[PDB]
Design a protein around this motif. Structure first.
Motif, mmCIF file in Angstrom:
data_model
loop_
_atom_site.group_PDB
_atom_site.id
_atom_site.type_symbol
_atom_site.label_atom_id
_atom_site.label_comp_id
_atom_site.label_asym_id
_atom_site.label_seq_id
_atom_site.Cartn_x
_atom_site.Cartn_y
_atom_site.Cartn_z
ATOM 1 N N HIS A 121 0.854 -1.184 0.000
ATOM 2 C CA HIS A 121 0.000 0.000 0.000
ATOM 3 C C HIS A 121 0.889 1.233 0.000
ATOM 4 O O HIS A 121 1.622 1.472 0.964
ATOM 5 C CB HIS A 121 -0.938 0.016 1.208
ATOM 6 N N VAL A 177 12.383 -0.170 8.171
ATOM 7 C CA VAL A 177 11.420 0.361 9.127
ATOM 8 C C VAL A 177 10.974 1.758 8.719
ATOM 9 O O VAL A 177 9.832 2.158 8.975
ATOM 10 C CB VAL A 177 12.017 0.349 10.548
ATOM 11 N N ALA A 229 4.602 3.947 5.110
ATOM 12 C CA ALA A 229 3.430 3.344 4.487
ATOM 13 C C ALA A 229 2.182 3.545 5.337
ATOM 14 O O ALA A 229 1.110 3.860 4.812
ATOM 15 C CB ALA A 229 3.678 1.856 4.239
ATOM 16 N N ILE A 275 6.487 -2.181 16.017
ATOM 17 C CA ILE A 275 7.621 -2.721 15.269
ATOM 18 C C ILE A 275 8.930 -2.139 15.789
ATOM 19 O O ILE A 275 9.923 -2.854 15.964
ATOM 20 C CB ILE A 275 7.445 -2.456 13.763
ATOM 21 N N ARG A 287 7.027 11.542 12.885
ATOM 22 C CA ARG A 287 6.122 12.619 12.504
ATOM 23 C C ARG A 287 6.167 12.753 10.992
ATOM 24 O O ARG A 287 7.163 13.234 10.440
ATOM 25 C CB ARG A 287 6.509 13.939 13.178
ATOM 26 N N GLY A 300 4.552 14.697 8.925
ATOM 27 C CA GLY A 300 4.600 16.061 8.428
ATOM 28 C C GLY A 300 3.291 16.422 7.749
ATOM 29 O O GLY A 300 2.698 15.609 7.029
ATOM 30 N N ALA A 322 2.599 18.436 5.269
ATOM 31 C CA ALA A 322 2.654 18.411 3.814
ATOM 32 C C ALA A 322 2.599 16.997 3.253
ATOM 33 O O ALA A 322 1.937 16.776 2.233
ATOM 34 C CB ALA A 322 3.917 19.113 3.321
ATOM 35 N N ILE A 338 8.697 22.044 8.823
ATOM 36 C CA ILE A 338 7.295 21.726 9.053
ATOM 37 C C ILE A 338 6.765 20.738 8.022
ATOM 38 O O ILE A 338 5.571 20.428 8.020
ATOM 39 C CB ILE A 338 6.437 22.999 9.081
ATOM 40 N N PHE A 344 10.646 -7.637 16.478
ATOM 41 C CA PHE A 344 9.224 -7.447 16.220
ATOM 42 C C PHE A 344 8.759 -8.300 15.048
ATOM 43 O O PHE A 344 7.646 -8.832 15.066
ATOM 44 C CB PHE A 344 8.933 -5.971 15.957
ATOM 45 N N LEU A 400 -1.645 19.041 0.584
ATOM 46 C CA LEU A 400 -1.005 19.883 1.587
ATOM 47 C C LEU A 400 0.313 20.447 1.073
ATOM 48 O O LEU A 400 0.609 21.632 1.272
ATOM 49 C CB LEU A 400 -0.786 19.086 2.873
ATOM 50 N N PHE A 401 1.119 19.615 0.405
ATOM 51 C CA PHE A 401 2.344 20.110 -0.216
ATOM 52 C C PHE A 401 2.033 21.109 -1.322
ATOM 53 O O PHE A 401 2.720 22.129 -1.461
ATOM 54 C CB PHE A 401 3.163 18.941 -0.764
#
Ligand SMILES: Nc1ncnc2c1ncn2[C@@H]1O[C@H](COP(=O)(O)OP(=O)(O)O)[C@@H](O)[C@H]1O
Lengths: 198, 116, 70, 62, 175, 230
Positions: free
Chosen positions: A21, B84, B90, B100, B109, B111, B113, E78, E159, F114-115
């Protein structure tokens, strides 16, 4: 040990979004969802014992060569270390070239120019829509045609020659046994290619 | 068996490695065993810069090339943690749920955008 | 710039062209080449090059660097 | 042409031309369907095994 | 062509008649030349009056470019996540291991080879086995980053093993 | 003053034919690969169906200009048309109609809207609004004088490619000096002050509305020489 088929099915179901995906657009995700239902059924366990085989005596010479080519393709899918680089290239389709990429890009550019002429001039009618749909269908059919022409013309002689060389080396009986659905892929992965210097 | 292991699975001594003139960058990595056969074949089979940069299957040096490609893929995935990384990219929710990698997920994070 | 007269007494190299430049060039090239060959031989007398490919330095040979024995 | 990763970055990974071998038609019958299903399962299991190896193949070298 | 232009006029190098006394108070402050003598330094930005005024004007004008840089940095920070970069994790005995080995060797604190009772400390450039400053902090940070990356890889492997075991158990649990 | 005829080996004019691809020259001969030669040679173009398609497609003959004086349609019953945009207004309307498709098309086709926003926001604020958006905002597409209300009925473009007409008091109209409106709209007048006449700009004082007319706009003498407009 547990069934490798069931274990792999469960793992794929768990990690399909972790491996298959990708981040796409809204229409991209919509098309992917449409394809997911349209995707074929991948059954982990396949009931292959219901098949009724026929002898290689029924098959002709070109038919036996085609069966050997199919066995070679199945092996290349299963045994990744069987054939050399040249044989692997022969057994697979050729890469898309400048002509094919340019044909696709020219079809896209023609469609873009037609859409610009439509939207800019506000010339949107039933005839224009039908012509655009027909052009898109014809472009798709032509793009499938160049791949068919290239694949046929190139591979078919090369595939026939490679199968004939391998037929004399391995044997029509071995090729048919590989073509038989009763073969085990685990042993097929451990099978040695007699034409592999290693 | 190992991704860095060669087809014959043999360890090259320091004298042989120096005799192979293997780059120090390759020696730093853990994929020396497969790169040894590929380097030996390339030195024994000269190819032009245009040839090597243009050949897709690396010509005659094919099996060693595949083994080195697998080893280098493993090395570059492990050193960059790209496995990872792509997993969390994904689906940030799935990675956080499955636990994981606690360290990777704790600072994950995406982001605003990049699809929030 | 448009060429202007220069003092003939002045030893200037401003746009000086010699008609017999070919012989002078040949003479300044040949003996210079001979001197360069001699200097190249002298310099190659004492040279250091990396060991050949496929050749490993056995540490027991005196060619390997030595340590001062206290 | 040879390095379209720049186009794959700014414009994304667009639709490639139709690349397929179309060689499974050498034979006919339900055996062909079984072989196609086996090939699809093999591709899926190859993806799963690649994921498993790339996840567990970090400790091969110590 | 078309006009027999004369020789280059001598006015091309006009002689300067010094109209002001070159006071010794400006020794070497003017590059002297028989044709067109000049000042020692050139200030083509004479629109700016003084060095303090010029600095003030430059700092006032640079604010816009500083703000543009800040905007670019914010737009990047950001819209991006921290990456996974560092020294080669598979090689711990190289640039990283050698530093710790040298810090554990401290051979510069040994006795003289001839019994001279003079050690490396008896020098202006003297060895110091307990510096813990300069590039040592950066080396420690690099080692911490490598350890974090290795721990992340090990946790990912663990994991994945746990996921595979859970899948096997669930497939086995159903029966 | 060429002396090419004196010397034989000198470059000839027939040799200097590859320079036509970069240097514009009056036609001397039509090439075999020329588009005109291809059109005039192939009997496929001689078919009647091709001629019928050529005569009945693309631009129509009705919309082509035919007079040095033109009269647009009437907005109201007693109004008097004064000024009208001809090509600049159409191009502005087409540009403003791009957002009617691109904005939904990108929304349904971009993985990172958003971009896209984080990119286009400075583009509008720093580069686009001062170039096209605000110019179209101040653009006067059509202007007529309604005598019954003694007002000006002006139809102008709107953000999503729309048309909107408003009536403004003629007594609220004031001549805007380019010097008076130079510095505060410097970048607006610098990047996109080219298409409007800085020597003729009006202002409705009621709401501080700025009215700008195209430098290539069409003005009617009868409307200009009216008692309402002096
Ligand atoms: N010896 C000197 N002492 C002080 N100022 C000088 C001297 N030489 C040159 N200058 C400065 O350089 C400038 C050039 O002078 P110059 O061109 O020779 O005079 P003018 O402009 O009358 O021909 C002058 O304005 C002068 O202030």
């Amino acid at each position: 040990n547990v069934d490798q088929h069931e274990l792999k099915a469960e793992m794929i179901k768990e990690l399909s979004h972790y491996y298959d995906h990708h981040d796409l657009s809204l229409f991209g995700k919509v098309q992917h969802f449409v394809e997911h239902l349209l995707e074929e059924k991948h059954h982990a366990k396949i009931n292959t014992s219901n098949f009724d085989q026929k002898k290689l005596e029924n098959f002709s010479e070109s038919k036996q060569i085609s069966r050997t080519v199919f066995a070679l393709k199945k092996i290349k899918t299963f045994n990744h270390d069987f054939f050399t680089s040249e044989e692997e290239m022969i057994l697979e389709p050729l890469p898309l070239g400048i002509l094919t990429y340019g044909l696709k890009y020219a079809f896209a550019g023609v469609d873009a120019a037609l859409l610009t002429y439509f939207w800019r001039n506000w010339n949107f009618n039933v005839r224009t829509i039908g012509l655009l749909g027909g052009l898109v269908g014809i472009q798709m059919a032509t793009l499938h045609i160049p791949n068919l022409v290239n694949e046929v013309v190139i591979q078919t002689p090369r595939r026939r020659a490679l199968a004939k060389k391998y037929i004399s080396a391995y044997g029509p009986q071995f090729f048919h046994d590989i073509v038989n659905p009763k073969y085990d892929i685990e042993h097929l992965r451990h099978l040695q290619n007699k034409l592999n210097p290693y | 068996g190992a991704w860095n292991e060669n087809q014959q699975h043999y360890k090259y001594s320091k004298e042989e490695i120096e005799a192979y003139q293997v780059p120090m960058r390759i020696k730093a990595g853990p994929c020396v065993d497969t790169y040894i056969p590929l380097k030996k074949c390339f030195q024994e089979n000269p190819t032009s810069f245009a040839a090597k940069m243009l050949d897709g299957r690396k010509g005659k040096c094919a099996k060693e090339f595949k083994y080195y490609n697998t080893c280098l893929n493993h090395w570059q995935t492990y050193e960059n943690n790209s496995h990872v990384t792509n997993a969390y990219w994904a689906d940030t929710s799935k990675a956080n749920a499955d636990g994981i990698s606690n360290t990777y997920g704790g600072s994950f994070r995406k982001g605003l955008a990049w699809l929030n | 710039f448009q060429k202007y007269p220069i003092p003939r007494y002045l030893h200037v190299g401003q746009w000086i062209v010699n008609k017999n430049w070919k012989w002078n060039t040949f003479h300044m090239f040949f003996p210079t080449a001979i001197l360069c060959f001699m200097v190249w031989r002298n310099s190659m007398i004492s040279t250091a090059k990396p060991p050949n490919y496929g050749e490993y330095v056995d540490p027991q040979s005196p060619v390997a660097p030595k340590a001062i024995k206290y | 042409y040879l390095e379209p990763s720049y186009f794959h970055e700014t414009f994304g990974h667009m639709s490639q031309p139709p690349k397929y071998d179309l060689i499974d038609s050498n034979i006919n019958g339900v055996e062909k369907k079984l072989n196609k299903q086996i090939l699809h399962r093999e591709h899926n299991e190859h993806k799963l095994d690649g994921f498993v190896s790339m996840f567990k193949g970090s400790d091969v070298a110590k | 062509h078309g006009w027999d232009r004369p020789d280059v006029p001598l006015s091309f190098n006009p002689l300067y008649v010094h109209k002001r006394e070159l006071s010794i108070f400006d020794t070497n402050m003017w590059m002297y030349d028989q044709v067109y003598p000049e000042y020692v330094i050139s200030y083509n930005e004479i629109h700016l009056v003084d060095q303090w005024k010029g600095l003030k004007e430059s700092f006032s004008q640079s604010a816009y470019w500083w703000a543009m840089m800040a905007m670019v940095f914010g737009f990047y920070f950001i819209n991006t996540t921290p990456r996974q970069l560092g020294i080669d994790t598979n090689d711990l005995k190289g640039f990283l291991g050698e530093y710790y080995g040298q810090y554990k060797k401290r051979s510069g604190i040994r006795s003289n080879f001839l019994g001279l009772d003079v050690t490396g400390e008896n020098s202006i450039i003297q060895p110091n086995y307990d510096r813990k400053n300069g590039i040592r902090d950066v080396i420690d940070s690099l080692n911490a980053d490598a350890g974090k990356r290795k721990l992340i890889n090990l946790e990912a492997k663990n994991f994945i093993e746990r996921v595979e075991k859970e899948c096997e158990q669930r497939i086995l649990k159903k029966g | 003053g060429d002396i090419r005829h004196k010397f034989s080996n000198e470059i000839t004019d027939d040799d200097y034919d590859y320079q036509r691809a970069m240097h514009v020259k009056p036609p001397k001969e039509e090439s075999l690969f020329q588009l005109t030669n291809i059109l005039s040679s192939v009997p496929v173009f001689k078919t009647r169906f091709f001629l019928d398609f050529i005569a009945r497609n693309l631009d129509t003959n009705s919309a082509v200009s035919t007079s040095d004086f033109v009269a647009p349609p009437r907005v109201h019953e007693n109004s008097f048309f004064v000024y009208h945009s001809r090509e600049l207004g159409n191009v502005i309307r087409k540009y403003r109609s791009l957002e009617s498709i691109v904005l939904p098309g990108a929304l349904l086709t971009f993985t990172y809207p958003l971009f896209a926003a984080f990119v286009a926001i400075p583009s509008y604020y720093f580069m686009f609004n001062a170039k096209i958006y605000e110019m179209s905002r101040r653009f006067v597409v059509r202007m007529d004088v309604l005598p019954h209300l003694e007002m000006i009925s002006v139809q102008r473009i709107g953000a999503f490619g729309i048309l909107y007409t408003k009536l403004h008091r003629i007594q609220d109209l004031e001549y805007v000096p380019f010097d008076q409106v130079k510095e505060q709209e410097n970048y607006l007048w610098a990047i996109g002050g080219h298409g409007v006449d800085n020597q003729l700009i009006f202002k409705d004082r009621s709401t501080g509305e700025f009215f700008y007319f195209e430098r290539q706009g069409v003005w009617d003498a009868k409307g200009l020489n009216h008692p309402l407009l002096n």
